[PDB]
Ligand SMILES: Cc1cc2nc3c(=O)[nH]c(=O)nc-3n(C[C@H](O)[C@H](O)[C@H](O)COP(=O)(O)O)c2cc1C
Ligand SMILES: O=C1c2ccccc2C(=O)c2c1nnn2-c1cc(F)c(-c2cccc(CO)c2)c(F)c1
């Protein structure tokens with residue numbers, strides 16, 4: 001009902017009137033103000049997942065980058081997301097790259113962005129989250145956890161200290177933290193995915209995390225690129241198991257440009273998201289699940305806009321999934337759509353619930 005209206009009329013009209021960055025800002029504002037109908041979909045028990053030390057009422061989250069500064073968290077839960085991830089947040093405020101820096105590829109159901117970690121900074125986000133900290137504690141108890149995605153400043157000399165500062169400041173306010181070493185839009189950042197740098201970096205992050213008081217001690221996940229070599233992936237899996245990293249987010253956007261893209265803006269610099277990333281992401285999930293023997297929780301992300309997309313990532317090894325780009329095309333109704341379709345497919349394929357389907361392709 002609302003799905004068709006948003007998909008065929010409202011969203012195409014917003015896109016026709018507004019450049020993508022302006023449209024994004026409007027979306028965040030409307031969401032923050034709750035200017036959206038409370039999702040009518042009631043989450044069934046078979047969508048519940050217990051992972052990362054928490055209950056998730058459903059496995060569909062909002063990916064990092066939509067609410068970079070923690071301004072729309074409650075509105076995103078109202079939209080029906082089972083968990084919310086904000087960020088990336090950098091230690092100091094920074095403006096990001098010059099405009100234009102976001103591009104729609106409607107023929108490909110894709111987006112290219114080169115925002116460059118535009119961030120209000122840790123202090124501002126800290127105070128935003130503190131203003132609703134007890135509300136979030138209740139939401140988390142009720143199965144709606146909060147993740148905080150940490151980045152590094154453009155002019156930072158010591159990347160590990162940037163992430164450490166993020167752990168110290170926002171760790172106490174998060175159910176999980178994400179060490180984002182896979183943005184394609186910060187020079188040198190992805191090199192932090194290399195084995196030696198990654199081990200040093202994550203050792204420091206986990207030390208800082210372990211130093212927080214117990215009820216303020218988050219899970220720590222690493223978010224990785226879809227563009228890794230086989231060697232890169234082996235090394236990451238090894239470091240993650242060695243250090244006891246709590247999970248992986250798989251994947252960030254791709255700097256590849258798959259054959260067949262039709263969008264006029266396909267050769268813009270930046271990370272590509274949406275459908276052209278979908279199966280690249282799913283295969284990266286599949287590989288990382290195998291390399292970690294299924295013992296390391298994966299949040300699967302990239303090109304999800306249907307129950308089938310979600311279930312493919314879950315069967316490949318994901319315990320949870322996220323989406324972003326689908327929102328920009330389908331609007332808020334896509335969340336209920338994915339959940340309804342996912343429940344139906346689980347039933348069709350003989351799964352008792354999401355948990356039974358995690359990694360099922362490997363078995
Ligand atoms: C405009 C835009 C901004 C993003 N910003 C971030 C970010 O700040 N940090 C991050 O870890 N991922 C960021 N992402 C990546 C998404 O979290 C996600 O990994 C990726 O877009 C694939 O999911 P999707 O195909 O559903 O959009 C951003 C993506 C887009 C499209
Ligand atoms: O190109 C982009 C884009 C690019 C890069 C990042 C983001 C976006 C992005 O959010 C977007 C785009 N085009 N349209 N939207 C968009 C616009 C909206 F108004 C809403 C929205 C949210 C809440 C309530 C209501 C009204 O009920 C509407 C929405 F979800 C998405």
Ligand SMILES: CCCCCCCCCCCC[N+](C)(C)[O-]
Pocket residue numbers: 107108109110258259275276277278279280
């Ligand atoms: C082998 C992967 C090649 C690159 C990505 C493949 C994209 C598959 C097409 C499904 C997209 C649906 N739509 C509306 C976006 O065109």
Ligand SMILES: O=C(O)c1cc(=O)[nH]c(=O)[nH]1
Pocket residue numbers: 065088113114115116117118180182183184185252253271272
């Ligand atoms: O801020 C950005 O440019 C950004 C960060 C990130 O992690 N991923 C992405 O696609 N963009």
